Amino acid sequence: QTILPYPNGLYVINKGDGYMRTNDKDLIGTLLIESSTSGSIIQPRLRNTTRPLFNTSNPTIFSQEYTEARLNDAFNIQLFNTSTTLFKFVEEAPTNKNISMKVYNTYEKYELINYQNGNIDDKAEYYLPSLGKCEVSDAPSPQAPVVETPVDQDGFIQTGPNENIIVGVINPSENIEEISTPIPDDYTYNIPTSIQNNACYVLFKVNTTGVYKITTKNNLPPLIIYEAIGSSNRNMNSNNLSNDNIKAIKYITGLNRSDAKSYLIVSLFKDKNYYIRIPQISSSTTSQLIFKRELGNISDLADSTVNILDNLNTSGTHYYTRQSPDVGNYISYQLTIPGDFNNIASSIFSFRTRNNQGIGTLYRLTESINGYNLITINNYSDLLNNVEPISLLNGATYIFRVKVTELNNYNIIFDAYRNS
């Protein structure tokens, strides 16, 4: 029931091992091991058959075969209902007492969800057959008084260690485009007309490791970038992008909100493959994808969506609702102060956030024939309660970086309060 700081799409969540049904529905058996004796229960795989458990909220789309396909994209699981993996338990009873050995079949719980705007619209649970659980304890007394006990509720209980590993997968209904050649310092990609019919992903790699600015020529629509998990250090070609059809993706930064005018600043390594998801462009005018390697401390924004703020030439509150980054991650805002530029002319501002807490950093963006450069103007250790005002040169451009420290809500609200 917690917040999921991820963009719209499909995710496979490994919710842990040791899952089993109630009422001993997965009990293999119990051995009474007398003192100075050893007992053992074995799953020898004399038959490789296993029985997975499946549960879906939408049988039509999220069918078992479909869910299995997702699990394959996420963790690359090959075998779903067979196993050659053996598991056995051995226990010796002490000289003084008798031991009870119970063994149960278990499952790893994989959750498939269709996450849309901070909400789960579809969901399936796939219980992958696991390698069992064994409980040993002092043998109960054959005379222990029998207690009428009502059966528990039908369901699952978790027996293994706490685990919750989220893995995003390429949405199988959105096509994949590919920039064959490693992108140089500058590059422009023309978004195919297919973008009019549905979102797509653009697979690529950079020739040189560094920080990059990526965006559409009008900072619209917003872009999202992912890393192809496990893509690093495999097949490689200096003059060509070797594909691994890796459908497992790690969200770096980006947003889904329609009016989030912005561009991305991320750190890219040449030995890895990345995916940029371009939303559906419902227009007849060809859009573009511009890539540019950045030199300089613009890298301070490394892995962040820089939201360009609009409608500033007014007084009072200036709210901007955006999907909140996860605790520890960034989200930036770019401000070009209303008015013309002459050092002296300024305007008073008070930066603040509303849903989530974080650490702010105010930068003064500057230009040079050697790229950009940020000058730290001030830092904020409390944005949710900031009241300290700051005067900014009119006609100048500032970038405010927020590091989330508390994820209370799906959206993080930024307030660029204007005092004058």
Binding site: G29, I33, I42, R47, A144
Partner: protein
Amino acid sequence: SINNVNLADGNYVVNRGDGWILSRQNQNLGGNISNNGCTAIVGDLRIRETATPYYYPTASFNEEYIKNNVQNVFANFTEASEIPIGFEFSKTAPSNKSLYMYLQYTYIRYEIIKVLQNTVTERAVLYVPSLGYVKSIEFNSEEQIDKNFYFTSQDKCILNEKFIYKKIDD
């Protein structure tokens, strides 16, 4: 006695627990003998082919009624039976003495009871093959052995008996 339950009137399916051994079947699988610090091991495989259920139906509760009602609340032994499971026991014989151990199958006792006035009116019984249990005894050609070691005259549980129920509907 054994028919006094504190349950409303109706039909229930009860899990009497794992660990049940059957009457006089004690030595059907055979016994093992060893000595002088040797380790003895006996095991098995309750392959569907062998390990078969024991039904004791009544008028109100026939075999099918018993099965479906049990596999509905508790472990589905019909499916599980297709997957071979093994178990073994080992024990070291004493330095200068002989050891004898024999094996027998254990079961899970399931019951279908008809309750009326906090008393069981009818009772069906099912024994689903579980795993196994071994009994040991040290000996020599001179020792006389308590014959209860070799023979069990009334079904019983080697663990603590249970009573986990669920009222049947329809």
